[PDB]
Symmetry: C2
Subunit: 503 residues, 2 copies
């Protein structure tokens, strides 16, 4: 039946091309948008017409009805708002064609342009009253009904239908753009300078992830898509751009789930002469101010367990708690971790902690992977009422963070979590090139046991460190996850217009 | 020689560490920046000292001098600006360390923190007068001097050295960011909605270009890096986002030269219910307003032939000329190119023009590539002292542009050129799904002849069109080339922080 609908509508298009018409007119010159029309004529009175004011209006037909052969009613939508179309034979311009013939061909989904006047129906419904209605672009398929899209992957593979049908989706993506705008303005007002660094590099560094690989033909050179922006931005700090940032895509070649899309939008900034404490305060200020900006309050509700389940309240009122990674793992496990974290005493203790709690064993069982799994199991859901920081990660987990000024073995690192999900990662930057090559060599040793996601050594980066990187504080944001929490979405797929799908 | 210097300075660091001193302190709390200092104390009287005003300041030493063991002079730079440092034994805090011991070890390039007071030399030079100076981060290599970067690829391979040494580089990249901010605001003020579409797609469409390809391991799926943002943005128009745009990188897998970098920054916008004419007016409004915003005038100077030759003036006063591509090619070659343009007779005629003029023959010699080569050799430099549009391209060159409402075989398309280089490409959008499929079919015939840049059919896109794409006008800008002209650069490498280079 939809197949036959499509065939009949395609036949209509070809028949028009025969009869003479161009069924897709080039240009219709609109005088007012639908939101503007609503704003302007909202206050008309019941049944009042302004028959002398002729307006040119466009939009998409989303409902079709009739009352006899001389009254046609439509819903017309544009820019997320809707007016009524009231087509009365009494106002029809018969010089442009037979009334019935004009309106009988209009179908739900059709894009039209209307020459008419504003008014209210006898029931007070604000309407455009056409004197002529022109098909501008036909909808050749039947659109799904308001609720006939609910569980479908169609929302993600045919996002335009979702945007037409599900009123909330447009609101979600508006909020996403507002969040990004707020962030860009927040940084620009603080003296920060926005740049673009390469998406493709000889080495994909600045995080611990498996990269995408591609090939430039003319240079005959394999290139890696970036997993982070950290290394070139620090190079720009050496260059004297003392407050610098970048908002754009990065790429990680791993699994897809509700909180992972293979390309995702990050913001990283580098702030010369800042440190860990400045970054804690920046995070608290930014998040409290963003939430207040959007919602006029610091507390929001979030359906963590889905729309059909009870929601929780997340309080963004600062300050947020800070939990030190090592000693919280020590309390939770009831164990005490070792002096050198790589010690086979420590490694065995961590493996046996994972086994004593039936936690999945990482492979290879590197000290860093073990600490990470322990953290995700014993800490990352310590709070759901409030965001919170996991801090003071060991140097073993943090090859680019500066060593802690008073806690040997640890670094001045912070990660903010919302509802168990990481949205922020930041630290006092490691800037002694002699310790940095050290960390890179330890990472190469980890790669010598099967650690694929361990970052490769970047020689250009190390040379730049040798020219003097001032003490600096750097921070990264996960934009998509932030948007998920601020739009009440459970899946990253609901905040990305075209998420990566199984084909 | 540079190896010996780096050797000695690495040893200096190690020795500092042995002796307990940490040469990379964790945190120095600064009171004021160098530009803020310069603004704040600019009206200080010559010779005046504010000993009552202790400030913490940071920067990079860029010049070392002395008058001997009791006066040390330095240049200190930050955020592209510079002050003098006048370290006087008389003002040294001796309880924190020995004066000569502290200042003897400072080297050009070192990042320092200074506790001291502001003042002016008797000759009027704004200076910080240290009571204490702390090394924060040493420079272990000799920095090149003021004119040391002239013609090397050091500027492109170590951009940070370029940004430190050549003041003009920072100006260029500041202007780049200003141009993009201006564009974003220009569009947002007009109701436009910024979005992000995927960098990786099952089919790379939206332009005629060779793509990069990569693989997603977990899904075991080959993907193409996007060559344009056009197709998903039009899908968003179908979805009802009637003014939509994207600024970001796209990727093309072809040769590198002065106007081609394998990744470059484009802006594409889609404007429901607009057409070719609105897009011409938009282009004239945007370029004239951008230039006036940056320069306070509509006329700029551009060294088309490099710094050693006279520049030309480019006048961005609108309106700009419009040159119909087929008509201009016919006038220049004194030919008639009868339709259909991809007929065997017209292809042979075009090939014969190309051979008669010793122009290089496109491979394969499709009708569209022959048209493009004729235009490249014959008409794209018709104007140099002003931008201009080449308009009304044939359908066979323009598979996504709407058939021209009064000139059969052509489309409602415009490209803007500056000094022979394309910076803008726009048209009334093709919104008939049946015609769209026909166009993809033709492009595929060319693909089968060997055109690795012809567009491949995207059925998902054609399906979106079957739900009704309103009449729409779309436009793309090449941000990097625009920035080249507005910063007086001859190479795209001068407006990209880290341009793609052949490995060393
Ligand atoms: C810049 C950085 C700072 C805060 C933590 C984020 C992790 C990042 C991890 C990740 C992996 C992946 O394969 C796909 C994804 O979408 C994400 C994601 O959203 N966040 C981002
Ligand atoms: C969006 C579009 C609109 C106007 C024409 C520009 C062409 C585009 C062509 C190109 C190819 C390449 O492989 C490397 C490059 O840098 C460029 C470039 O800079 N501009 C961009
Ligand atoms: N590169 C980090 C974000 C910034 C960390 C601080 N320099 C990440 O991918 O998690
Ligand atoms: N996608 C085009 C720019 C937009 C043309 C108008 N839809 C290009 O890459 O040149």
């Amino acid at each position: 039946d939809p197949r036959l609908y499509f065939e009949n509508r395609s036949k209509f298009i070809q028949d028009q091309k025969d009869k003479g018409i161009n069924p897709y007119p080039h240009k219709f010159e609109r005088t007012i948008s639908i939101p503007e029309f609503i704003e302007k004529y909202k206050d008309l009175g019941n049944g009042e017409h302004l028959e002398d004011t002729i307006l040119n209006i466009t939009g998409r037909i989303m409902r079709v009805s009739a009352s006899g052969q001389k009254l046609r009613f439509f819903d017309l939508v544009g820019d997320g708002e809707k007016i009524q179309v009231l087509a009365n034979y009494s106002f029809h311009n018969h010089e442009k064609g037979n009334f019935a013939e004009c309106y009988d061909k209009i179908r739900r989904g059709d894009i039209v342009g209307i020459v008419g006047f504003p008014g209210k129906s006898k029931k007070g419904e604000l309407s455009i009253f056409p004197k002529e209605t022109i098909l501008l672009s036909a909808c050749l398929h039947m659109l799904p009904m308001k609720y006939g899209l609910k569980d479908t992957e169609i929302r993600y593979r045919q996002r335009y239908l979702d945007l037409l049908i599900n009123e909330s989706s447009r609101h979600t993506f508006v909020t996403r753009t507002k969040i990004i705008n707020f962030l860009r303005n927040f940084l620009n007002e603080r003296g920060f300078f926005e740049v673009e660094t390469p998406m493709m590099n000889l080495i994909a560094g600045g995080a611990n992830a498996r990269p995408f690989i591609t090939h430039h033909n003319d240079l005959d050179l394999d290139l890696y898509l970036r997993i982070a922006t950290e290394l070139p931005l620090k190079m720009l700090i050496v260059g004297g751009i003392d407050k610098v940032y970048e908002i754009g895509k990065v790429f990680r070649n791993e699994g897809i789930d509700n909180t992972h899309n293979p390309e995702f939008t990050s913001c990283e900034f580098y702030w010369a002469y800042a440190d860990y404490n400045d970054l804690i305060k920046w995070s608290e200020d930014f998040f409290s101010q963003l939430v207040y900006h959007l919602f006029g309050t610091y507390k929001i509700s979030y359906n963590k367990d889905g729309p059909e389940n009870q929601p929780i309240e997340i309080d963004f009122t600062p300050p947020y708690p800070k939990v030190s990674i090592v000693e919280e793992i020590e309390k939770v496990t009831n164990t005490i971790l070792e002096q050198p974290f790589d010690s086979n005493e420590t490694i065995e203790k961590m493996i046996n902690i994972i086994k004593e709690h039936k936690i999945e064993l990482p492979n290879p069982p590197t000290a860093a992977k073990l600490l990470d799994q322990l953290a995700s199991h014993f800490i990352e859901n310590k709070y759901n009422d409030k965001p919170f920081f996991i801090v003071e990660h060991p140097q073993i987990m943090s090859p680019l963070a500066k060593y802690h000024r008073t806690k040997p073995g640890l670094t001045e690192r912070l990660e903010m979590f919302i509802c168990g999900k990481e949205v922020l990662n930041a630290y006092t930057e490691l800037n002694d090139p002699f310790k940095q090559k050290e960390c890179f060599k330890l990472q190469q040793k980890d790669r010598e046991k099967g650690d694929t996601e361990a970052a490769q050594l970047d020689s250009a980066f190390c040379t730049s460190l040798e020219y003097g990187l001032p003490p600096t504080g750097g921070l990264g944001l996960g934009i998509d996850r932030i948007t998920m929490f601020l739009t009440n979405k459970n899946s990253i797929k609901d905040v990305i217009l075209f998420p990566t799908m199984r084909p």
